């Protein structure tokens, strides 16, 4: 891991954590990710999660 200087390594770890976290945040605000598992039966509005 010598090629990239130790600065970018920690920058990248923190960036990955931040990007994953903001993706999680936007997942809640998302309109359509709520995808009612097994929509073969629309019987009940079981609005459930992903991401």
């Amino acid at each position: 891991l010598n090629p990239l200087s130790p600065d970018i390594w920690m920058y990248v770890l923190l960036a990955c954590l931040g990007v994953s976290c903001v993706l999680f945040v936007i997942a809640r605000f998302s309109p359509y990710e709520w995808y009612n598992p097994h929509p073969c039966n629309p019987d009940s509005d079981v609005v459930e999660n992903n991401f």
Binding site: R28, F29, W34, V47, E48, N49
Partner: peptide, 9 residues
Amino acid sequence: SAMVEELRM
């Protein structure tokens, strides 16, 4: 209602 529904879950 939208924020509560998508927040508490």
